[PDB]
Amino acid sequence: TSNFRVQPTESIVRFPNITNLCPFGEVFNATRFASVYAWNRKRISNCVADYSVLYNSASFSTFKCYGVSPTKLNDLCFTNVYADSFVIRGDEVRQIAPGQTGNIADYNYKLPDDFTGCVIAWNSNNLDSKVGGNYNYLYRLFRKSNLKPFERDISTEIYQAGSTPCNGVKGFNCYFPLQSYGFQPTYGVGYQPYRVVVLSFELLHAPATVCGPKKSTNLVKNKCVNFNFNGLTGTGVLTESNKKFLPFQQFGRDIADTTDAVRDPQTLEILDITPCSFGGVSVITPGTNTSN
Amino acid sequence: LKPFERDISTEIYQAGSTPCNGVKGFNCYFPLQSYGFQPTYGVGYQPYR
Amino acid sequence: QCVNFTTRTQLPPAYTNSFTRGVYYPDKVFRSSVLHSTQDLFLPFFSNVTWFHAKRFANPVLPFNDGVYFASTEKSNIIRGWIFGTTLDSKTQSLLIVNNATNVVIKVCEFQFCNDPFLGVYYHKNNKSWMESEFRVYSSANNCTFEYVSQPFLMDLEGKQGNFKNLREFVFKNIDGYFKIYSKHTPINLVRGLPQGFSALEPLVDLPIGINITRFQTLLALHRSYLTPGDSSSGWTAGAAAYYVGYLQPRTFLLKYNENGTITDAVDCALDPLSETKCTLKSFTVEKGIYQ
């Protein structure tokens, strides 16, 4: 008539103990962070970035991801991210987060077309809002230039009035190329400046090297579970086996194109794969009128 | 959501895994945002009946 | 430095044949007592591999013919470098892979490569000091945009004892975006040329780069003694090694595994009609009779 089967009891996923690293504390907790106009496009590659310790982390002024869901970031294994070392005022959140292309957002910075660069601002209260006289933070507005997105400032010439040559710190309507951020000890509450950095993903025109960890499962044996040893899904029951598995080899195989033994990414162990409960059933019965 | 279901009786969610109440919290918002379009803008956000 | 001239005649090479070498475990999975066949970039047997005398400054730029099989045997660490990329210029940002007793570095910095400068250790600068001095391979390192380091090549210390000259084969396989390296250190005793038998090359690195590669060049690192500066190519030419190069074209091998999952004998189907029969019948012994 039919065939019986036992459903998988648990679900097992196995890609643990590789250690992403991809440090982000130095990106966030910087002893002497760079100025707004020194926003070097620091690529962050060859790492497994983390977001749970940041997205779920509280005490952040603006943790926004408009161009992509913050939760799904760890799933998406994009190429890499670009970190820009720029610091804004507490009330200067309008220039950042593309969607408000202000004039100030076109001189000392430029906005990408889409919000790939998730703007993250953390409250560096002790450092940014200190009594040290933060007059060093200066931002470039007046240089008679208009740069482009994802490129640093392209003009360092002295600012000129226009159609009138001038040189030095004094001239006919010629102003200092740098503009001064206040950041005085009064910048404590209301619009306290926050250190800002973006994580702009790169599309996969080239092979990726950045992703995010999700989870892992403990060791279960002699039970019908989802198998999923880093790609090899399909439920089964695992038994201890004693095959070789030279170090470069991780998956077993049989002549009839089937996987029958595996290596655990946790520790180098030899396991097995066996169908769980497949098998037909037949119903022996005499004549219905004779017996039931 | 399954097809043919109009659930307008919605509450504030918990995006940041922080159980919240009232009308505001951290990572807690009301997701019933509005388009707010206007006739001055052309095609792209033009209302379609 | 960047401009010099050779110290040899006009290419008197040799084209010896190993008659069977260059199987490198094409797939990740593990098999035992199986005769799996796959269409992959392999080295056909009985193929003319060009000779390369280490004592005659023999190291020109070589094309990347669908992955390059490089093999060398020596009782020393003469050959260390492998430079390859699109066109091998600074603008194109080619790939650099070298070897050192301390580490192994991978870089893509803009290099003109200055006509392949040699490398070598100065003899007895101090009693307990042996370090490479003339490290002139650097050619205007700028706009690096990327840098990488890997595990130090330190297995070239055992297996050559007694002037065995452990032959090492490095297949520079590429998967159009990803780069793979295979190696195998097995002691030998033949000095005439390539040995006979088989190979069990294992993968080394799967890391991708994303740079198309058409030409290849290796750094022979010829350095007899620092006493004679020569013409930067003359004098530092002699050596006691002879490496070889091989190029891979599409092929369908008949790989045989063993109880330890060790490849023992492979059959190149296109090599001979007998090998065609062996591949079609899917075995190593062909019973007498006519086959289609």
Task: Give me some keywords for this one.
4-stranded antiparallel β-sheet; part of a larger assembly; 292 residues; Spike protein S1 (chain C); 3-stranded mixed β-sheet; 3 chains
Q: Which helices and strands occur, and which strands form pairs?
A:
The structure is cut from a larger assembly and holds three copies of chain A.
Chain A: E1 2-3, E2 10-11, H1 25-28, E3 41-44, E4 47-48, H2 52-55, E5 60-63, E6 81-84, E7 86-87, E8 120-122, H3 125-128, E9 138-140, E10 178-180, E11 195-197, E12 200-201, E13 210-211, E14 224-226, E15 236-237, E16 280-281
Parallel strand pairs in A: 2-14, 4-13
Antiparallel strand pairs in A: 1-16, 3-6, 5-8, 6-12, 7-11, 8-11, 9-10, 14-15
Structural account:
- This is part of a larger assembly, with 3 copies of chain A.
- Chain A has 3 helices and 16 strands.
- Chain A is elongated.
- In chain A, the strands form 6 sheets. Chain A has a 4-stranded antiparallel β-sheet with strand order 5-8-11-7, with no helix packed on it.
- With 292 residues, chain A is mainly beta.
- The A-C interface holds A 45-46, 205-207, 209, 243-253, 255, 259, 261 and C 25, 28-32, 34, 36, 146, 148, 177-178, 202-203, 207-210, 259-262.
- It is classed as viral protein.
- Keywords: SARS-CoV-2, Spike, double deletion, viral protein.
- Double deletion S-2P trimer(1 Up).
- Chains A, B, C are Spike glycoprotein.
